[PDB]
Scaffold this active site. Structure first.
Site, PDB file in Angstrom:
ATOM      1  N   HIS A 439       6.574  -5.703   4.936  1.00  0.00           N
ATOM      2  CA  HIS A 439       5.429  -6.695   4.100  1.00  0.00           C
ATOM      3  C   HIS A 439       4.150  -5.665   3.467  1.00  0.00           C
ATOM      4  CE1 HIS A 439       1.841  -5.656   7.392  1.00  0.00           C
ATOM      5  NE2 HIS A 439       3.369  -5.212   7.793  1.00  0.00           N
ATOM      6  N   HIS A 441       0.827  -6.864  -0.521  1.00  0.00           N
ATOM      7  CA  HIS A 441       0.880  -7.946  -1.218  1.00  0.00           C
ATOM      8  C   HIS A 441       1.565  -7.342  -2.894  1.00  0.00           C
ATOM      9  CE1 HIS A 441      -2.708  -9.297   0.988  1.00  0.00           C
ATOM     10  NE2 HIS A 441      -2.295  -7.891   1.004  1.00  0.00           N
TER      11      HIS A 441
HETATM   12  C1  LIG Z   1      -2.343   7.870   9.392  1.00  0.00           C
HETATM   13  C2  LIG Z   1      -2.587   7.766  11.083  1.00  0.00           C
HETATM   14  O1  LIG Z   1      -2.516   8.180  12.317  1.00  0.00           O
HETATM   15  N1  LIG Z   1      -3.464   6.153  11.702  1.00  0.00           N
HETATM   16  C3  LIG Z   1      -3.751   5.414  12.712  1.00  0.00           C
HETATM   17  C4  LIG Z   1      -4.352   5.139  12.118  1.00  0.00           C
HETATM   18  O2  LIG Z   1      -3.763   3.506  12.046  1.00  0.00           O
HETATM   19  C5  LIG Z   1      -4.048   2.821  10.768  1.00  0.00           C
HETATM   20  C6  LIG Z   1      -4.397   3.065   9.365  1.00  0.00           C
HETATM   21  O3  LIG Z   1      -4.626   4.864   9.319  1.00  0.00           O
HETATM   22  C7  LIG Z   1      -5.094   2.359   8.074  1.00  0.00           C
HETATM   23  O4  LIG Z   1      -4.212   2.578   6.945  1.00  0.00           O
HETATM   24  C8  LIG Z   1      -3.940   0.853   8.380  1.00  0.00           C
HETATM   25  O5  LIG Z   1      -4.472  -0.355   7.633  1.00  0.00           O
HETATM   26  C9  LIG Z   1      -3.925  -0.807   7.557  1.00  0.00           C
HETATM   27  C10 LIG Z   1      -3.684  -2.559   8.565  1.00  0.00           C
HETATM   28  O6  LIG Z   1      -4.095  -2.518   9.480  1.00  0.00           O
HETATM   29  C11 LIG Z   1      -3.383  -3.267   7.876  1.00  0.00           C
HETATM   30  N2  LIG Z   1      -3.438  -4.759   8.569  1.00  0.00           N
HETATM   31  S1  LIG Z   1      -2.712  -6.425   8.667  1.00  0.00           S
HETATM   32  O7  LIG Z   1      -1.455  -5.333   9.018  1.00  0.00           O
HETATM   33  O8  LIG Z   1      -2.841  -6.755   9.581  1.00  0.00           O
HETATM   34  O9  LIG Z   1      -1.980  -6.403   7.011  1.00  0.00           O
HETATM   35  C12 LIG Z   1      -3.635  -3.453   6.166  1.00  0.00           C
HETATM   36  O10 LIG Z   1      -4.305  -4.169   5.749  1.00  0.00           O
HETATM   37  C13 LIG Z   1      -4.920  -4.302   4.701  1.00  0.00           C
HETATM   38  C14 LIG Z   1      -4.822  -5.737   4.204  1.00  0.00           C
HETATM   39  O11 LIG Z   1      -3.752  -6.647   4.661  1.00  0.00           O
HETATM   40  C15 LIG Z   1      -5.096  -6.528   3.089  1.00  0.00           C
HETATM   41  O12 LIG Z   1      -5.253  -7.374   2.761  1.00  0.00           O
HETATM   42  C16 LIG Z   1      -5.933  -5.483   2.437  1.00  0.00           C
HETATM   43  O13 LIG Z   1      -6.647  -5.117   0.782  1.00  0.00           O
HETATM   44  C17 LIG Z   1      -7.240  -6.081   0.297  1.00  0.00           C
HETATM   45  C18 LIG Z   1      -8.355  -4.762   0.420  1.00  0.00           C
HETATM   46  O14 LIG Z   1      -8.555  -4.146   1.461  1.00  0.00           O
HETATM   47  C19 LIG Z   1      -9.205  -4.167  -0.519  1.00  0.00           C
HETATM   48  N3  LIG Z   1     -10.081  -3.431  -0.873  1.00  0.00           N
HETATM   49  S2  LIG Z   1     -11.722  -3.187  -1.186  1.00  0.00           S
HETATM   50  O15 LIG Z   1     -12.071  -4.605  -1.722  1.00  0.00           O
HETATM   51  O16 LIG Z   1     -11.739  -1.818  -1.564  1.00  0.00           O
HETATM   52  O17 LIG Z   1     -11.835  -3.260   0.181  1.00  0.00           O
HETATM   53  C20 LIG Z   1      -8.935  -5.542  -2.535  1.00  0.00           C
HETATM   54  O18 LIG Z   1      -8.527  -5.387  -2.736  1.00  0.00           O
HETATM   55  C21 LIG Z   1      -8.908  -4.591  -3.782  1.00  0.00           C
HETATM   56  C22 LIG Z   1      -8.492  -2.283  -3.836  1.00  0.00           C
HETATM   57  O19 LIG Z   1      -8.538  -2.182  -2.716  1.00  0.00           O
HETATM   58  C23 LIG Z   1      -8.735  -2.484  -5.237  1.00  0.00           C
HETATM   59  O20 LIG Z   1      -7.765  -0.861  -5.549  1.00  0.00           O
HETATM   60  C24 LIG Z   1      -8.443  -3.376  -6.223  1.00  0.00           C
HETATM   61  O21 LIG Z   1      -9.286  -2.729  -7.587  1.00  0.00           O
HETATM   62  C25 LIG Z   1      -9.349  -2.587  -8.470  1.00  0.00           C
HETATM   63  C26 LIG Z   1      -9.427  -1.557  -9.701  1.00  0.00           C
HETATM   64  C27 LIG Z   1     -10.079  -2.534 -11.374  1.00  0.00           C
HETATM   65  C28 LIG Z   1      -9.598  -3.606 -11.554  1.00  0.00           C
HETATM   66  N4  LIG Z   1      -9.502  -4.065 -12.666  1.00  0.00           N
HETATM   67  O22 LIG Z   1      -9.696  -2.936 -13.682  1.00  0.00           O
HETATM   68  O23 LIG Z   1      -9.269  -5.242 -13.202  1.00  0.00           O
HETATM   69  C29 LIG Z   1      -8.666  -4.647 -10.501  1.00  0.00           C
HETATM   70  C30 LIG Z   1      -8.474  -4.086  -8.977  1.00  0.00           C
HETATM   71  O24 LIG Z   1      -9.404  -4.308  -5.919  1.00  0.00           O
HETATM   72  C31 LIG Z   1      -8.436  -4.761  -5.371  1.00  0.00           C
HETATM   73  C32 LIG Z   1      -9.132  -6.804  -4.718  1.00  0.00           C
HETATM   74  O25 LIG Z   1     -10.325  -6.683  -5.641  1.00  0.00           O
HETATM   75  O26 LIG Z   1      -8.574  -7.086  -5.010  1.00  0.00           O
HETATM   76  O27 LIG Z   1      -8.229  -6.963  -1.369  1.00  0.00           O
HETATM   77  C33 LIG Z   1      -7.672  -6.870  -0.332  1.00  0.00           C
HETATM   78  C34 LIG Z   1      -7.063  -7.979  -0.406  1.00  0.00           C
HETATM   79  O28 LIG Z   1      -6.250  -8.789  -1.783  1.00  0.00           O
HETATM   80  O29 LIG Z   1      -5.606  -3.638   2.472  1.00  0.00           O
HETATM   81  C35 LIG Z   1      -5.785  -3.877   3.987  1.00  0.00           C
HETATM   82  C36 LIG Z   1      -6.869  -4.124   4.653  1.00  0.00           C
HETATM   83  O30 LIG Z   1      -7.147  -4.504   5.917  1.00  0.00           O
HETATM   84  O31 LIG Z   1      -8.766  -3.865   4.005  1.00  0.00           O
HETATM   85  O32 LIG Z   1      -3.401  -2.661   5.207  1.00  0.00           O
HETATM   86  C37 LIG Z   1      -4.109  -1.522   5.755  1.00  0.00           C
HETATM   87  C38 LIG Z   1      -3.640  -0.791   5.040  1.00  0.00           C
HETATM   88  O33 LIG Z   1      -3.850  -0.237   3.782  1.00  0.00           O
HETATM   89  O34 LIG Z   1      -4.448   0.816  10.114  1.00  0.00           O
HETATM   90  C39 LIG Z   1      -3.321   1.493  10.514  1.00  0.00           C
HETATM   91  C40 LIG Z   1      -3.360   1.229  12.437  1.00  0.00           C
HETATM   92  O35 LIG Z   1      -2.478   1.230  13.140  1.00  0.00           O
HETATM   93  O36 LIG Z   1      -4.401   0.670  13.030  1.00  0.00           O
HETATM   94  O37 LIG Z   1      -4.937   4.015  13.414  1.00  0.00           O
HETATM   95  C41 LIG Z   1      -3.758   3.627  14.460  1.00  0.00           C
HETATM   96  C42 LIG Z   1      -4.786   3.473  15.558  1.00  0.00           C
HETATM   97  O38 LIG Z   1      -4.990   2.050  15.833  1.00  0.00           O
HETATM   98  C43 LIG Z   1      -2.998   4.313  14.459  1.00  0.00           C
HETATM   99  O39 LIG Z   1      -1.657   4.193  15.448  1.00  0.00           O
HETATM  100  C44 LIG Z   1      -1.858   5.230  16.431  1.00  0.00           C
HETATM  101  O40 LIG Z   1      -0.822   6.277  16.168  1.00  0.00           O
HETATM  102  C45 LIG Z   1      -0.797   6.873  17.000  1.00  0.00           C
HETATM  103  C46 LIG Z   1       0.786   8.186  16.879  1.00  0.00           C
HETATM  104  O41 LIG Z   1      -0.565   9.228  16.065  1.00  0.00           O
HETATM  105  O42 LIG Z   1       1.897   7.703  17.032  1.00  0.00           O
HETATM  106  C47 LIG Z   1       0.354   6.100  18.817  1.00  0.00           C
HETATM  107  O43 LIG Z   1       0.413   6.218  19.143  1.00  0.00           O
HETATM  108  C48 LIG Z   1      -0.583   4.737  18.771  1.00  0.00           C
HETATM  109  O44 LIG Z   1      -0.182   4.196  19.539  1.00  0.00           O
HETATM  110  C49 LIG Z   1      -1.012   3.969  17.726  1.00  0.00           C
HETATM  111  O45 LIG Z   1      -1.852   2.962  17.515  1.00  0.00           O
HETATM  112  C50 LIG Z   1      -2.538   5.621  13.455  1.00  0.00           C
HETATM  113  O46 LIG Z   1      -2.296   6.518  13.742  1.00  0.00           O
END
Ligand SMILES: CC(=O)N[C@H]1[C@@H](O[C@H]2[C@H](O)[C@@H](O)[C@H](O[C@H]3[C@H](O)[C@@H](NS(=O)(=O)O)[C@@H](O[C@H]4[C@H](O)[C@@H](O)[C@H](O[C@H]5[C@H](O)[C@@H](NS(=O)(=O)O)[C@@H](O[C@H]6[C@H](O)[C@@H](O)[C@H](Oc7ccc([N+](=O)[O-])cc7)O[C@@H]6C(=O)O)O[C@@H]5CO)O[C@H]4C(=O)O)O[C@@H]3CO)O[C@@H]2C(=O)O)O[C@H](CO)[C@@H](O[C@@H]2O[C@H](C(=O)O)[C@@H](O)[C@H](O)[C@H]2O)[C@@H]1O
Ligand SMILES: CC(=O)N[C@H]1[C@@H](O[C@H]2[C@H](O)[C@@H](O)[C@H](O[C@H]3[C@H](O)[C@@H](NS(=O)(=O)O)[C@@H](O[C@H]4[C@H](O)[C@@H](O)[C@H](O[C@H]5[C@H](O)[C@@H](NS(=O)(=O)O)[C@@H](O[C@H]6[C@H](O)[C@@H](O)[C@H](Oc7ccc([N+](=O)[O-])cc7)O[C@@H]6C(=O)O)O[C@@H]5CO)O[C@H]4C(=O)O)O[C@@H]3CO)O[C@@H]2C(=O)O)O[C@H](CO)[C@@H](O[C@@H]2O[C@H](C(=O)O)[C@@H](O)[C@H](O)[C@H]2O)[C@@H]1O
Ligand SMILES: Nc1ncnc2c1ncn2[C@@H]1O[C@H](COP(=O)(O)O)[C@@H](OP(=O)(O)O)[C@H]1O
Ligand SMILES: Nc1ncnc2c1ncn2[C@@H]1O[C@H](COP(=O)(O)O)[C@@H](OP(=O)(O)O)[C@H]1O
Ligand SMILES: Nc1ncnc2c1ncn2[C@@H]1O[C@H](COP(=O)(O)O)[C@@H](OP(=O)(O)O)[C@H]1O
Ligand SMILES: OC[C@H]1O[C@H](O[C@H]2[C@H](O)[C@@H](O)[C@@H](O)O[C@@H]2CO)[C@H](O)[C@@H](O)[C@@H]1O
Ligand SMILES: OC[C@H]1O[C@H](O[C@H]2[C@H](O)[C@@H](O)[C@@H](O)O[C@@H]2CO)[C@H](O)[C@@H](O)[C@@H]1O
Lengths: 654, 287, 655
Positions: A439, A441
């Protein structure tokens, strides 16, 4: 269709159903609940078969090996006996009915095949399998037989097969490593075929033929379980229950079944069933009442087993039980028994050679490419995708699949040609992630162009163009509640959506409505040409031709309901999880201000809106049509339609 | 080894000489070593539920003991691509002139046929003739009733069954070109069979000979038919539903004619199938 | 997803990973770069899985036999050690890691299986394989065993198989003539099965069972490599490393692996990895530090090997190494080991007969896995097709694929239904031409209708409608320079293109502009209906839905650049060949006269032109879009973009 206020119980025909019915009358006399005990034909594989047209029993009685497939199909309710009750039953029998961490059945008794011989016709039973062709010689001249048992069921045949080294799924967890065609399996079955070749036994011998030949004293030995002891007593034939013979110096390894009682997930009387099993059956009074009709073997109840263990026959059953192995409750056991039943019958009737029959059954046991599935949800921003995806995450562990998120640099939804190629390669050839749920975007990517073997399954959920933009607008301003720690990109912008539109702002320009169309149109240039008529048309064709199902945000519950019915591998239990989960409305935008009638009115003047809307209502009308044809509305909730087609006039016959 | 992993789907359209063609498959299946199965749907509804679609696709592709196979039945076109199968089935069909098919179907429900003259048909005991019905603005002869062959190709999408849909028409054409191996027309069924024998000889080896000398070539004639007046046909042709359903027919027809034109040679008497007209050359490396 | 500014290293579990980690701490102390050394299960299978997603370790340690498949999949970076470095390592070890002319790994040590016997339990080890059933007899009565080794891996089994004459891919360059079912192979394996039949050995014996049975002194002999020497020293069991026994009087021929370190093609730390391997590992300090954890065998470093060669055990390893053969690094080795692993396990468990098991594995070694690709370039006339196609011809030998030209009667671009079926059948089931590049002037043919398993990949190049017509005009009149001997069809026609148009000629009628649309529209009737609006639309849908990439003549260089990046199997080195080949502008029409502004103006009035042009600009605007998203313009030229996606939040977890 299951009547409330009464209990209906299904138990196997050869067991003590009359004895269980005695316990049914004691429950009826005490609680007023009518208990009906029935013994339908072929319930080993036809419990959900005829239940696709009629919902029936509340309690089901069978060996624990089937109860896993029932559980995965969601046909059982997770039983909840208190620890005070679990401590009066043998802890190993609870493991026999533990599937996916939780209990699914109440273990009754432990059954196992033993060797039964005629004391009169044969004082000293053979220790080995090899001294039977020699023993059949002298008995043939008298007018008798050395051995007679069920050859139509692989249950009786398996002790000889697993003797020299045959097995099914090695217990490391169990894997897809089937051994029904190794040395031990072939050697065991070949000897059985040679017993029919040398006319020491008939290949048509079933259960009734076997039982009649022994109780009438026409054969010296037979193979059966505890349940057949009661029928020999009524024949006055002096018998003895001993340990199974040894093939190639190896003790026979019969499969050990644990008679279990599970509660129907559809049954409204789950509280009456729980009370019946715990308080009326699984007690010394209840088990003894059933034991009087047909012996259960070694019961799981600690109390009543201490008294049954003082039996010469029960001692032999628990002996062969330890020589053999407890059957796994994995869902593959249903396909395993079918595969072996086929191999045994074919090898015995000469319709196939032992080497070839087991080689065929070798691959019918597992690895049926049902695991080679891949779903791609290319989620559109702010359409309740987070809530839906988290269902995939909660079920993936239990339903045995993998969920991966696709991340793209600066969230750009279009991949470079070289990245497209790699993505496609990955999705399709990354075997260790199948079945998988990718899954992210990403715009719609067409796998056909790259010449893959199997395409992935595409699904999606879209939202009303304006309501989505508004939700996305305030999202960048204020953030959400799923991850309230992230500071969003345009945070620190005070202007409200309505104020922005009136001021002709850039974040609320009509061009910003163009997103859902390109997300379906794909990685083609014209898709991202804002306001393109071609792009619209192509987006519609892709949604119809390539997307398995696309639902709408505001009707997400029905979208999930349909997926559970169509792709149950991924979504079994998704609907229940949604309705009772508290994780169903994730990522609410913190501060939202719904648009004025005046604001909405001005956006609707834009052609970019008219198109983005036309696509929406197109996709919506489609979903509504799909649902309409998949469900029936029977006063209140929708119910998924049964199978409405079948095959006929199938020639040649055969 | 031999290529036994083939599956044809003939989603037959009602009253288009489908019984006659299908019985060829039945007569040859034994001899040409394949299987023929008929698909039956509740109340003859040509649209399957999503869950039924998945089941059907699963069967067709993974039911190994029925391969090679010829599934046939009055089902709307179903796209196997969506479900991510390894190998798609081969789709073929036969369509008929929209009006002549409706008229044929009209009198069929009234009087039945001669293939199974025992069945009592659904609207049996209705005296009104087709022409009288049209003039009286009846339900069974309304222009909306002409809409059938288009959705049968358009498929299980909502817009297909939206009567008079321009989108439905276009999609139906695109499916016929992109997904259907060959679609012939009733009134030229002999040539349709001739081409299938040449293209898919595994299924239709000897199909043409069987057709020409079989006495089982014109099956299920509607017992009592009354051809429509020039006046009756003229009024039906005023309907946009007709203009579209016709446009699709001539499209599919023009296509078949093209296909045949490029596969055969007309030499003094009978059409002869063309030999192979391509080859590979400059094949490197050598080695 | 690979973190920049640190090094992650994967090395096999049975090797000296704790010793390598010592070298990691010395690199971290000196440069500040954190080094993490891990030993994942099934490492050889895990790396290509992970590295394909653009993830994995920066450095990967395995025997060189796998490193070719990794290279072909483009999972390795071409290492560049200077000659000053290459001269301190044995030149033959550099050949072990040379794939397609370039180096792809840093050779560490040379490992080979040897016979290890218990000095106490057995003073004089057997020199032949046959005197083992007799030796097991007396040891069985005492409560011991004659031999115990890993039967689950074909690595340990192969010395006995290759003994009498078994082989894999004869060395001519390696051929794909596999010999795992000949006399020697069957004779070798049959004897191994008879050792289990006679219960001299158990068929379930793996590595852990073998090692434990020997270190505890329950078995007299065992088969292993240098890496298992360290674990016997901790058992105080007096042992000896000798030469492998002889089967049928033939010296055993174990496969000789060279432990190599390659750099992940996705790793951003390719400079840190290069420095670590060259300066911290491949030095006397580094190798000695690893050698003290688990022995490496005979190292590739000239310096440290002179000191290790003075070892009684290393002497035996290099002995068996010369008896056996160095493994090929060909990509087929991955399918080879799988095939043999299956044959061995089946034969040993009685699940299959030796004769039958090897016969099955015989044809599994030539497994056309990633080799099952087919490109179709249905070339449009006078669009620089000859130039492009000749690149395919020049690379096909080197990049290991086949190029076939499709010829049609009277060059008619539409195939008869029966010919369509035959062509499709050929393309997809002609296994000895895969991967293949079929090309020819044939209209677009849809393989989906015919129910194939795998569709071919369609590519094409189109040209501006008018410029193409003009080129094709003068081509029939005067011919080209590629084959100047052919007398062309309408040769001997004096009228120029401009004069023809003005005179309303037949060869320059607007109807003749209609060609590029039907070529994409396909074998349907409406496609060849000149001026059809439907044909246009369908032609566009096919180009988007079915064609992998369609470029334009006047930007052919960029088209080739993108293909080299997307389908490198076919076009690795195509761009270099184009830029420096002198075979890049083939088949120039001898005498051409460019059209007047007046002539062009009249053609543009035609609807047939307006459509044929609309299609062109559509296909063009698409190509420009494709390129725009695939490259970066860093001053003057263009450079292909790196990977810009990755997978995360992957549940369920392991661990
Ligand atoms: C490495 C590690 O060990 N990690 C740990 C840790 O795990 C974490 C991860 O670290 C973490 O990354 C991850 O996050 C996931 C999230 O969980 C996931 N959720 S979902 O599944 O429900 O979907 C998902 O979330 C996404 C959303 O889906 C998106 O919608 C969202 O997009 C947004 C975006 O954020 C916005 N950006 S913002 O404004 O800056 O905030 C925006 O988009 C922007 C974009 O960002 C810009 O780049 C862009 O820029 C420009 C520039 C120029 C320009 N122009 O000129 O025209 C235009 C644009 O602009 C756009 C924009 O304006 O739209 O909007 C977007 C939506 O449209 O992003 C995410 C969000 O929620 O914000 O994905 C993220 C990752 O991306 O989560 C995990 C997790 O598991 O929770 O922690 C866990 C503990 O919980 C650890 O897991 C454990 O591990 C252990 C182990 O060592 O084995 C294990 O034992 C344990 O059991 C286990 O739990 C893990 O290890
Ligand atoms: C189970 C059994 O007994 N088996 C025996 C037996 O085999 C038989 C089968 O039993 C028998 O079912 C099968 O019949 C086949 C038939 O042979 C086949 N012919 S075909 O291959 O040439 O095509 C095929 O015939 C179809 C036609 O193809 C269809 O066109 C036709 O559709 C009609 C439909 O009938 C109409 N309905 S009617 O008006 O009621 O008459 C109508 O559709 C209706 C629809 O029915 C209505 O429900 C619907 O209702 C509404 C209501 C409202 C509404 N609204 O408000 O809008 C709308 C709709 O309306 C629609 C409608 O009006 O459109 O029109 C349709 C056409 O458009 O149906 C069939 C027909 O001919 O009537 O299929 C049928 C099955 O469906 O034949 C086999 C056979 O083999 O002959 O007997 C054999 C022996 O002969 C046994 O074989 C032996 O087996 C032994 C063994 O193994 O045990 C073995 O030992 C022996 O050797 C072997 O011989 C076999 O076991
Ligand atoms: N079960 C559900 N039904 C309808 N809308 C939902 C929903 N779960 C979450 N949403 C809404 O979907 C949006 C989040 O989208 P996503 O998860 O794709 O990022 C939020 O919208 P709002 O901004 O109106 O609050 C959230 O309220
Ligand atoms: N070989 C053939 N050529 C043309 N029409 C045929 C034919 N065989 C059967 N038909 C006609 O096709 C109709 C039967 O269709 P089906 O078999 O699909 O139910 C009947 O039409 P009529 O009603 O005009 O008699 C029958 O006459
Ligand atoms: N690298 C290149 N870039 C642009 N045009 C090229 C080219 N190589 C060959 N051509 C032109 O392509 C035409 C030959 O096409 P083809 O090889 O398909 O038969 C000739 O056109 P001209 O007639 O203008 O000379 C030739 O000049
Ligand atoms: O033979 C296949 C069958 O074996 C077992 O069924 C047994 C059952 O355990 C006993 O209680 C008794 O009913 O005899 C049966 C065989 O006739 C497995 O339990 C069952 O899953 C399997 O189908
Ligand atoms: O057995 C198949 C396997 O053999 C070799 O792997 C060896 C490796 O070379 C040694 O370093 C050590 O790890 O033992 C391994 C076998 O257990 C091949 O190198 C490898 O390609 C192949 O899969």
């Amino acid at each position: 269709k299951i009547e409330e206020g009464k209990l209906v119980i299904w138990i196997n025909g050869d067991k003590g159903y009359n004895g269980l019915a005695e316990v049914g009358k004691k429950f009826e006399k005490d609680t007023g609940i009518k208990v009906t005990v029935e013994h339908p034909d072929k319930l080993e594989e036809k419990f959900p078969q005829v239940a696709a047209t009629g919902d029936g029993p509340d309690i089901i009685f069978w060996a624990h090996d089937r109860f896993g497939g029932y559980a995965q199909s969601g046909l059982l309710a997770e039983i909840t006996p208190d620890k005070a009750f679990q401590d009066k039953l043998y802890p190993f029998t609870w493991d026999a009915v533990r599937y996916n961490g939780k209990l699914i059945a109440y273990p009754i008794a432990v059954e196992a095949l033993s060797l039964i011989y005629n004391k009169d016709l044969l004082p000293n039973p053979p220790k080995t399998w090899e001294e039977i062709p020699a023993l059949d010689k002298e008995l043939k001249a008298k007018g008798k037989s050395a051995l007679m048992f069920n050859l139509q069921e692989p249950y009786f045949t398996w002790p000889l097969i697993a003797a020299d080294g045959g097995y099914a799924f090695k217990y490391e967890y169990d894997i897809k490593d089937v051994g029904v065609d190794n040395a031990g399996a072939k050697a065991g079955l070949t000897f059985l075929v040679d017993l029919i070749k040398n006319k020491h036994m008939n290949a048509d011998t079933d259960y009734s033929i076997a039982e009649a030949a022994f109780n009438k004293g026409e054969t010296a030995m037979t193979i059966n379980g505890p349940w057949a002891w009661s029928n020999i007593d009524t024949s006055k034939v002096n018998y003895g229950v001993t340990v199974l013979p040894t093939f190639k110096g190896q003790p026979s390894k019969p499969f050990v079944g644990v008679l279990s009682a599970g509660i129907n997930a559809a049954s409204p009387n789950k509280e009456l069933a729980k009370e019946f099993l715990e308080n009326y059956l699984l007690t010394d009074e209840g088990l003894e009442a059933v034991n009087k009709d047909k012996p259960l073997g070694a019961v799981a109840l600690k109390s009543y087993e201490e008294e049954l263990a003082k039996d010469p026959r029960i001692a032999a059953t628990m002996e062969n039980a330890q020589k053999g192995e407890i059957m796994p409750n994995i869902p593959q056991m249903s396909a395993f028994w079918y595969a072996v039943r086929t191999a045994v019958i074919n090898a015995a009737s000469g319709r196939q050679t032992v080497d070839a029959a087991l080689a065929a059954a070798q691959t019918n046991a597992a690895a049926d490419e049902e695991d080679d599935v891949v779903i791609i949800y290319n989620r559109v921003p702010k359409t309740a995708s987070t809530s839906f995806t988290n269902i995939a995450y909660d079920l993936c562990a239990k339903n045995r699949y993998h969920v991966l998120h696709i991340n793209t640099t600066k969230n750009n939804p279009v991949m470079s040609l070289q990245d497209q190629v790699r993505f496609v390669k990955n999705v399709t050839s990354w075997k260790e992630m199948k079945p998988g749920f990718y899954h992210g975007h990403v715009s719609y990517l067409d796998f056909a162009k790259f010449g893959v073997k199997k395409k992935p399954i595409y699904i999606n959920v879209i939202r009303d163009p304006i309501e989505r933009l508004v939700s996305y607008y305030y999202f960048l301003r204020f953030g959400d509640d799923y991850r309230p720690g992230l500071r969003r990109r345009k945070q620190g912008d005070k202007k409200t959506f309505d104020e922005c539109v009136a001021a002709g702002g850039s974040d609320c320009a009509p061009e910003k409505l163009w997103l859902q169309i390109p997300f379906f149109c794909g990685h083609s240039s014209e898709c991202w040409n804002v306001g393109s008529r071609w792009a619209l048309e192509q987006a519609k064709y892709n949604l119809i031709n390539e997307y398995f199902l696309v639902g709408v945000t505001e009707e997400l519950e029905d979208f999930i309901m349909l997926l559970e019915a169509a792709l149950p591998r991924f979504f079994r239990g998704a609907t229940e999880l949604y309705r009772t989960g508290k994780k169903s409305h994730l990522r609410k935008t913190t501060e939202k201000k719904l648009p004025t009638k005046e604001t909405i009115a001005k956006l609707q003047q834009s052609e970019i809106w008219k198109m983005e809307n036309e696509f929406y209502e197109f996709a919506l009308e489609q979903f509504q049509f799909v649902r309409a044809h998949a469900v029936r509305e029977k006063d209140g909730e929708l119910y998924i339609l049964a199978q409405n087609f079948f095959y006929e006039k199938i020639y040649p016959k055969s």
